[PDB]
C-alpha cells in the first residue's frame, strides 16, 4: 500500500503536513522541534528542563510546579504538570493558567 | 495567551504532538523529517529529488512523472505530481497508484 496520498514539503524537502483516514497537521509548525531549546526557551533551565530530564531518566516523571512567564506587562503565573504517558514511551507537559 | 494546553514530548524533549481548537498530530511520526533523505530514500536521486530542487529553485514547480517502487514481489508503478502550493511558500507531492 501507499503510505501517503499528499505530502506538504518546505523548500528543503522537510515534511510540514500530510494526508494518508490519516492526516498529519502542525498548524504551529513545531513538531520535531525541541520544546525546551527551540520553542519555549525560558524552560531551558534546571527548574523545568532539568526536572524533565530527571523524570525521564528515573523512569517516573510526575511533577507539578508553578512557572512564571515574563512579559512586557509583568509576569504571568502558570501551573505546569509533566507526566509520563500512560501508554508507550512519551511524556506530556500540561500548562494551565493559575486562577 | 497560552499557546499550548498539552504538548507531547519524546525523551529528548522533541515535540511529537500537541493540543492548543488547534491540534498537532503526526501519526506516522514524520513531520520535520526530510522526505527525500529520511522517509522515502528511493526518491533521493536526480529523477525525483533532483526535479524537486529544480522546481523550487526556478520558482515554478509543476512536474508529473511515473515512479517505480521496488518490492520483494516486483515493482509497483505510481504517478507522482509535484506542484508548488497555490498559497504560501510550500510544495505538495501527490502520489497515486497507476491503474
Numbering used by the authors:
A (entry chain A), B (entry chain A): 25 to 44, 48 to 126
Please share text taken word for word from the publication where this structure appeared.
One of the most promising protein among various FAPs is the so-called FAST protein (“Fluorescence-Activating and absorption-Shifting Tag”),14 an engineered variant of the photoreceptor from Halorhodospira halophila – Photoactive Yellow Protein (PYP). This photoactive protein covalently binds a hydroxycinnamic acid. However, the replacement of several amino acids (including the key cysteine responsible for covalent binding) allowed using it as an FAP with a group of fluorogens. In this paper, using NMR spectroscopy and X-ray crystallography, we have studied the structure of fluorogen-activating protein FAST both in the apo form and in complex with the fluorogen.
Through the whole of our study, we crystallized the FAST protein several times, either in the presence of various ligands or without them. Surprisingly, we found that the protein adopts a form of the ligand-free domain-swapped dimer in crystals under a wide variety of conditions. In this dimer, the first three strands of the core β sheet (A30-L33, I39-N43, and T50-R52) are exchanged with the corresponding elements from the symmetrical molecule, forming together one large twelve-stranded β sheet (ESI Part 3†). Contrary to X-ray data and in good correlation with reported previously, both forms of protein are present in solution exclusively in the monomeric form (the determined hydrodynamic radius was 2.1 ± 0.1 nm, which corresponds to the 15 kDa).
